[PDB]
């Protein structure tokens, strides 16, 4: 909406107010939209035990496709956007401008895979707030969508060749960042809550949990046609917003379908000492801010 010239602007996607803001808005919208029949939230220290707080409420079944959330500048501030096609969210940017609001953004809730998001405009791009740190999420973003179709009957389908081919594009970009002599391996999640261990997403108002092992089992730079993932709806969630357990009602539809486009991934690097030359990667996520970051990286907000 205005292309500032002779202007150089530091960005640091890793310290962006917008991310936190979006996150509070999203969380807030789900709470309002999708209410559980029982919500267990523990409160601590005080006394000795940890007095767990319980909220029981009517839990109307509600499923509908989340509409895109545009995010805008609050009274007093301004939104700068970087116009580079490729962009690592850090340092100076010169092709930049001010804008009313950000683009529409699907407030999709999920782990491992980023569904229905923006594709990279050139090549596959990988992001971290510290690649050296084997504890920080690696955000992948694709230039090509990969369909993934899921059903309440308990599975997700994916074209093996498309995926197989997506993995090539990444392992490639990975050994570009960790040495070109390095072997890229993909393995299943290494443990933790089901929501982190499986590719967990919402759909029809129901929470899916899909065994993604089949997607992360290969070795690069060292069959069957359509990958079918076993899944499961659960009524007992670990919440993503705050640390709570929540029980929802069983489903009331026999036709719960979900055709989404994988547009990015949340990986995690094993790392660790081992003069051995190869890098292990596993499907990560769980921290929805990573998800908002995958979309808001090209943005910053500044005192007018």
């Amino acid at each position, epitope marked *: 909406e205005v292309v500032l010239v002779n202007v150089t602007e530091n960005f640091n996607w890793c310290k962006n107010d917008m991310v936190e803001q979006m996150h509070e808005d999203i969380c807030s919208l789900w709470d309002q939209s999708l209410k559980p029949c029982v919500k267990l939230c523990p409160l601590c220290v005080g006394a000795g035990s940890c007095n767990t707080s319980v909220i029981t409420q*009517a839990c109307p079944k509600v499923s509908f496709e989340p509409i895109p959330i545009h995010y805008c500048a609050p009274a007093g501030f301004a939104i700068l956007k970087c116009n580079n096609k490729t962009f690592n969210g850090t340092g100076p940017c010169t092709n930049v401008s001010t804008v009313q609001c950000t683009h529409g953004i699907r407030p999709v809730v999920s782990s491992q895979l980023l569904l229905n998001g923006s594709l990279a405009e050139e090549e596959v791009v990988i992001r971290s707030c510290n690649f050296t740190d084997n504890a920080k999420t690696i955000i992948v973003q694709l230039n090509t969508s990969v369909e993934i179709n899921c059903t309440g009957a308990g599975h997700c389908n994916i074209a093996r060749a498309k995926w197989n081919n997506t993995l090539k594009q990444i392992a490639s970009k990975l050994r570009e960042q960790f040495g070109n002599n390095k072997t890229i391996i993909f393995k299943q999640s290494s443990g933790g809550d089901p929501e982190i261990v499986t590719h967990w997403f919402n759909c029809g108002g129901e929470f899916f949990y899909c065994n993604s092992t089949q997607l992360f089992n290969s070795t690069w730079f060292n069959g069957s046609d359509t990958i079918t993932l076993p899944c499961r709806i659960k*009524q007992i969630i670990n919440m993503w917003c705050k640390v709570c357990k929540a029980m929802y009602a069983p489903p009331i539809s026999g036709q719960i379908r979900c055709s989404s486009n994988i547009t990015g991934l949340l990986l995690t690097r094993d790392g660790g000492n081992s003069n051995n030359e190869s890098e292990i990667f596993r499907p990560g996520g769980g921290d929805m801010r990573d998800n908002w970051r995958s979309e808001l990286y090209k943005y910053k907000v500044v005192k007018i």
Partner: antibody
Amino acid sequence: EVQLVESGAEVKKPGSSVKVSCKASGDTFIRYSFTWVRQAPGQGLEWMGRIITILDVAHYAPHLQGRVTITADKSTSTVYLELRNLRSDDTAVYFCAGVYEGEADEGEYDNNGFLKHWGQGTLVTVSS
Amino acid sequence: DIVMTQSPATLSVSPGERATLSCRASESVSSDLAWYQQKPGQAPRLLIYGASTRATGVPARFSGSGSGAEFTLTISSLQSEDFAVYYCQQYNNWPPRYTFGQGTRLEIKR
């Protein structure tokens, strides 16, 4: 196919409180929910409350609220009913009942409100 | 709350004949309806749930139907051990405040 075995009869003076138990055998405790139901002589059945064993969250009839507590010790598969400030009209047989609710430990929970399994009943008599 | 009225209070059926028990709510409860059976001195026995599902162990001459607020139980042919008291329970609302009927007493007619 769980077996529910309750505790012996209780004799209480009005104002006393009572705690009846219910040992649950042969299956997976945390996969069941337990509901206490009672019946005055010559009278019908009355839902008292219900515990979601795996969450330790119990819900109660609005007309007992405050003076009834239901609990469950997962480490011995036993369930408990506590009636406080007893009245003569609290004299009844208190039953212990439960239905299977799904692979709970794995997120699955029907939240069934029927009652397939019962105990033999416990007579609680409240009187001067 | 949801009041559950059963009729009639007493059913005098002749052995081997047809019994039909009516259970009526004071508002819709979809299919969250169950029928129990009680014999003097013992715990009840779940018969039907979901308005029309026979519990494991229940014979076929037992069958329940209806939904919303209009429910009914049928015993196609009466064995001697079928004469008892029958209760209907609703378990629809949330938070959960489930309610029973006052029962129908089914007795041998002679």
